[PDB]
Amino acid sequence: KEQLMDDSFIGLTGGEIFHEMMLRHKVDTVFGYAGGAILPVFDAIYNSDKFKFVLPRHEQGAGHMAEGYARASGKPGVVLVTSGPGATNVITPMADALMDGVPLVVFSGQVPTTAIGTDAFQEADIVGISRSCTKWNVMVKNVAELPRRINEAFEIATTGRPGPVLVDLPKDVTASILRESIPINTTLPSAVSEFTSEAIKRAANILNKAKKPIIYAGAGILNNEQGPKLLKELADKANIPVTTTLQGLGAFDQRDPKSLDMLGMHGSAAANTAIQNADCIIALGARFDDRVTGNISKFAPEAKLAASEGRGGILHFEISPKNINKVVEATEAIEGDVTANLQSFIPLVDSIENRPEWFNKINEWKKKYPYSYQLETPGSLIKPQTLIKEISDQAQTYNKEVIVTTGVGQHQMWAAQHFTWTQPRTMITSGGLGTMGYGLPAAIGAQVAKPDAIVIDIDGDASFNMTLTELSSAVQAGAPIKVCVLNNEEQGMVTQWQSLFYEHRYSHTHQSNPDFMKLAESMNVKGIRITNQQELKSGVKEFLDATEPVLLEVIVEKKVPVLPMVPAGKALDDFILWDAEVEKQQNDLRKERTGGKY
Amino acid sequence: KEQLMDDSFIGLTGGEIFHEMMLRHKVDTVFGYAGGAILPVFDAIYNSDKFKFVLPRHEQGAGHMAEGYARASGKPGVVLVTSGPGATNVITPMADALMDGVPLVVFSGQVPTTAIGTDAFQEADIVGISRSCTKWNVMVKNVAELPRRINEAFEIATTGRPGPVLVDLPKDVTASILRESIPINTTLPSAVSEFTSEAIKRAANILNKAKKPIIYAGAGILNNEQGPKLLKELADKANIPVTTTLQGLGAFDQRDPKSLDMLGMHGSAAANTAIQNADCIIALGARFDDRVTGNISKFAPEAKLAASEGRGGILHFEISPKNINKVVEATEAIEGDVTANLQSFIPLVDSIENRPEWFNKINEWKKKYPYSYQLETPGSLIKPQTLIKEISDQAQTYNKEVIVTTGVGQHQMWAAQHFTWTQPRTMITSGGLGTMGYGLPAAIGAQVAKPDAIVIDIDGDASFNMTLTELSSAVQAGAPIKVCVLNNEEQGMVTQWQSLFYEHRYSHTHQSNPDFMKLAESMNVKGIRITNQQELKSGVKEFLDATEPVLLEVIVEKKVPVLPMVPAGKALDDFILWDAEVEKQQNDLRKERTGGKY
Amino acid sequence: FEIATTGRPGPVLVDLPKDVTASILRESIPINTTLPSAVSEFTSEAIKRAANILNKAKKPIIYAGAGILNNEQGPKLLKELADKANIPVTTTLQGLGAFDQRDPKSLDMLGMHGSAAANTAIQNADCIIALGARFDDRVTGNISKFAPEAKLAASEGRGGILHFEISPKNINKVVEATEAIEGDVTANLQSFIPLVDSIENRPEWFNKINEWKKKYPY
């Protein structure tokens, strides 16, 4: 019994116990902001050399920083905030983390247990509020159960589909001293079923019949280091073209001939065409989000027909049962970690040297469906697509890893389309919730996770405006991030929809921008401004060559649609393609309708 | 039956119906930010001349702006945002509004009803999330019930204790067209009980026995235009000294001899002394918050004794039954609007010409307990207390109303203490939740509510850093707000607690500031910087004389405590007072302990 | 009362504090509160599409449930449809009585303990007309193996599942509907039936049906 109890924490405050448990969980970075309720914990971590503390300007900043840290490192991102407004300010990042499967462990101070439920000073019901945007939350009620709750939080956050958890820490608990022994298992952090094994064999048999297979890969494949390796091994062995979600970008080397690029609403029309014509869809760590499937009832016709005929269908490798058969019926559901299950799957799959007819179609679709757009003309502004390509081409010249974060909007889609993705965890973007303001703090967090990487925030001007105060935080953290603001002086993605569906009635979608160069100067950040085509190359080089935080502003063409586009309600292969004459007519119509204002 | 049904909305979209209902509710200002889910409503309000639309940089900005608008105008503040991150970004303002009793009506876009519950693109469970930080919320499920839900929202927000409500608007509902007639009562917006009348008579009898009465007045008295008038009438008739909460500032003219100033943790020791010695406490629209009562079991000893002896006690005029007998037992509870009940109360109260002994004590306590502090010395930095006085004195010179907003921290308390408050709805500050970042957007909203007022944001540097992007919003809205940043390069209120309780261990409470003058310039805002004593007067004058948005930065003394102070756990009259020698010793100790760093 | 009786009917609870029910009304109230209380383009198109699908069917079956009972004309229209297009009818446990079981077209109850003839017929039908039924797990059997012939028909554009359902929550909850017809099933049948082609005989289908009934008594 003495062997099962631990007394080594006796005499410590809850705060000191928190500090010790952080260490035992190999936490090397904490993002947070002080306040009254969380003071006992802040006193305990005072001048700690055991981890780096990152101080934002706003707790939303801390949340998104921790998300960026988590996406870049594969470790849980740890947040430490005070009660009340400190806690409610992390709600958007928690909801963000939930939608995108990001392991976020949020510790929020709380008013003393004697004051809870009295509408106390700086008291929020954060457990109630955050219940719908966490995998799990808890309020620690005494110091003896604090190690257990910390263990549970980290475990739940990082297993299954990763996600945010919140642990509420009353001030009197974290100030109290442990007087009793606790189970030694709480002071320490932490086979394939017959059913799954049979499903795997059945799925392999199905794939071995396929004549038009396609791999549809997502974020799940990134949650294991061997993930991308096994994905490639499968695609090579069975000779299968690979498409990814926005969140799967980097899982497959896009320079590979088998790469179909990104699928979905703004993905490649070649990818969208191929998945609509495939007889076998291998879904690896992807959840069939509504940005990807198009009109659900019209999605994957050829795979549905194949399943009914016993010669194909959908093979879904998914770790979370909630997401199995949620949107589309899986022909075979393979539950568990996709990477681990691929190890069992692949040796049952027949090696295939050639698929002449399938790959003839694939290669034809790729040739006819590039990411085309209207090029610059003499005197015109820089096109946003051209800027992205310029940044992508120059960024590879360096002998360093390149990590990209984005805001939300057109710039995000163009970044997705026009970068060439080759490495896992290099696309760090808000996809499920789609939070503007994400780009800058996510970049700081990723840069902290990866001090030797080039970290680039491709940001819209409206998105960037939302959290631009965190520039100071990059300087204070020593994070030499590279922010590129595409200045089109509009909420481009909304105006695209207003041009398309509301007859060019731009309702409150043009916000005023600060002078970004003077803003950078005020934040002690290097500033670069590119205003014309002739400055593009040299401007981007100065940007990438910088060894300090740097803000690049680029003046880009306004009222330019992201294409291709699958409009809401349309089948995944019923897309709009770029056309020069159509664009010209669209400009004329916009000009007349707005009286030349746009 | 034809007389009871209305068909006048038939043929309109939900968005157009929303627009019409705004008008019928006399909404003249909407604060919001666009996005996909709320596009049908934005299309409907496109180029509306029926109200002013205010566009922030961040939806939290919209929320706090609407709060400031609501506090300044007495009208509900209306917020219009999109789904997902648009909605979760308003959570802190809603929680803020709930704690401070602010009528906030939040309209959030939602994904189409066909997509709800599928983890859809930009879908948040905002009804679930916001349940604990709203009086009430609802999701509109068809267009026919949209007028009814809007009516209910405005009614609930503005009656009882005012508070935030949220109305969730699915995109397909707001895009759908009304095809059927609806009850005409839903297309149009909207005696004292025997029990209360008897309680009033009993309370009057109790007051007529009192020898040491005191009025404890709060935000409730401000929720009626006749409120301050009746408060004064009562105090004059029965010869009663008046103290207010932070949220009650302006309810009573502080230049009146009867004024005891603010009570509580950082209120006047004279006020705190008087309430601890009063035999009759008349609580008018105040909720006995824990910042005000001190140690609850030791609060109001003389009033408790008087009640037990049938010659005094606590008379609580409260509109919300939840807040009656929540913290302290009321001797008599008078339910309902305090102003309306005062009309019945006052004529039952005996007129009193003099209370020689009580007012002798009062006047002695006022003389011995001023808001004393260490004055400037030659070459020293400006003291934050002196700056507030300078701003207060000069601001009265103008023939205009003066409205003050604040951030949260020491500057907030010094603003409360050292301004002279004389008019209702001139103190607009976050008290219950205590949200940093509140000051700037609240000022913009108040300035929009009151275009002819001088609106001053007394802000801390850390608070201001949290939402400083909204400077651009002030320019774009044409709101000539006056922001004064007290730059002490610290989170002063937290460092005060760290000096006091954690032996000068300043754990992560010193954030780096931008260059505020270059920041202002980048935002197209006038900038003034005061760095020494000799510039104080002329700097503040330039600040107040400006006719454009203006940012004043003042370099102020660091590591200065707010005094008086009732430490947590101490009786309301067991306070710390300012002492010159103590301050000097405290400085020496801080200097040695930090090795001269502080 | 309104919420309880509209949409899919269900329970509601109203909590009545004693002081409220003892208190006396002192103020006037909106007169609309003292008194109790068209087909969308989208649904109308779905109905036409569903009728086209049924007119192609060679092995149709009606799967009828409690919803058809929530209108007095329900059973009448169910019979009118089955008679016009010559369609065998099976019901859930909760649909019993919706169709006269003495009728030759009756397949009796389907499901875990239903007629093996009914269960056989629904597994072999190319068109399933679901009328006010929610595909409960007592009825579908193994979901992934349910209605193979209807799934194949949908993929081939010659059949599928036509779901007449009043509650959107229950549409595409368990099985994908080829066409979803939202609203009251009885009201929608009035629009549906005249678009359906009259059929006098289905010799091969009903030969199978009658054989299954003979070999699968209780």
Ligand SMILES: Cc1cc2nc3c(=O)[nH]c(=O)nc-3n(C[C@H](O)[C@H](O)[C@H](O)COP(=O)(O)OP(=O)(O)OC[C@H]3O[C@@H](n4cnc5c(N)ncnc54)[C@H](O)[C@@H]3O)c2cc1C
């Ligand atoms: C403006 C905008 C436009 C967008 N347009 C597109 C678009 O055109 N194309 C596109 O693809 N996206 C687009 N999105 C993003 C989209 O909304 C989703 O965020 C994204 O598609 C989801 O990708 P995912 O399924 O791979 O990742 P996730 O949403 O994270 O889902 C991963 C799935 O894998 C599972 N999983 C996790 N770990 C494991 C494991 N170890 N083993 C097995 N399974 C696991 C998860 O449970 C989950 O089911 C857009 C976003 C925005 C803001």
Ligand SMILES: Cc1cc2nc3c(=O)[nH]c(=O)nc-3n(C[C@H](O)[C@H](O)[C@H](O)COP(=O)(O)OP(=O)(O)OC[C@H]3O[C@@H](n4cnc5c(N)ncnc54)[C@H](O)[C@@H]3O)c2cc1C
């Ligand atoms: C750093 C900091 C320090 C603070 N220190 C202090 C301090 O020293 N002193 C201090 O006073 N505050 C202080 N506070 C603020 C404090 O937390 C509360 O916000 C404030 O005291 C509440 O004042 P109130 O009761 O008047 O207003 P409210 O919290 O709004 O309560 C008003 C009450 O009146 C009721 N009411 C509303 N309308 C009516 C009506 N028409 N008729 C009748 N009743 C009505 C309400 O239901 C409620 O019960 C501090 C805040 C911060 C951030």
Ligand SMILES: Cc1cc2nc3c(=O)[nH]c(=O)nc-3n(C[C@H](O)[C@H](O)[C@H](O)COP(=O)(O)OP(=O)(O)OC[C@H]3O[C@@H](n4cnc5c(N)ncnc54)[C@H](O)[C@@H]3O)c2cc1C
């Ligand atoms: C021991 C036991 C064994 C059972 N075994 C069987 C079995 O073998 N076979 C069997 O059938 N059942 C069986 N059940 C019952 C089964 O669990 C379900 O209760 C039943 O099958 C549901 O039938 P239903 O879908 O018709 O009715 P409901 O569950 O009431 O569903 C009716 C559907 O129609 C919709 N609807 C309602 N009104 C309308 C309207 N006006 N217009 C359009 N749609 C409407 C509803 O929203 C709902 O989706 C068994 C129960 C028990 C206790």
Ligand SMILES: CCCOc1nn(C(=O)NS(=O)(=O)c2ccccc2C(=O)OC)c(=O)n1C
């Ligand atoms: C109004 C002054 C603001 O400064 C502070 N007040 N304060 C505290 O008041 N700390 S506290 O344990 O005794 C407390 C008691 C009752 C209700 C709430 C709290 C609380 O945790 O507030 C954060 C606290 O810890 N700080 C820093």
Ligand SMILES: CCCOc1nn(C(=O)NS(=O)(=O)c2ccccc2C(=O)OC)c(=O)n1C
């Ligand atoms: C990924 C592109 C982002 O741009 C937009 N997408 N979008 C929409 O997709 N609008 S939508 O009605 O058909 C929709 C359908 C399913 C799930 C969610 C939504 C939604 O409301 O998203 C906001 C929409 O309205 N906009 C502006």
Ligand SMILES: Cc1ncc(Cn2c(C)c(CCOP(=O)(O)OP(=O)(O)O)sc2=O)c(N)n1
């Ligand atoms: C916090 C928040 N508010 C609103 C939205 C809605 N929204 C808005 C307003 C977009 C326009 C973004 O503008 P941008 O300048 O950042 O980028 P682009 O001009 O390249 O589109 S995109 C989008 O989904 C959002 N995603 N997040």
Ligand SMILES: Cc1ncc(Cn2c(C)c(CCOP(=O)(O)OP(=O)(O)O)sc2=O)c(N)n1
């Ligand atoms: C959003 C948020 N985070 C944290 C806190 C906790 N907190 C903090 C960090 C304060 C210091 C404020 O610093 P300041 O510079 O704005 O003002 P002073 O220096 O005058 O105190 S005051 C306070 O309550 C808070 N109130 N709100």
Ligand SMILES: [K+]
């Ligand atoms: K690419």
Ligand SMILES: [K+]
């Ligand atoms: K004062």
Ligand SMILES: [Mg+2]
């Ligand atoms: Mg833009």
Ligand SMILES: [Mg+2]
């Ligand atoms: Mg400060």
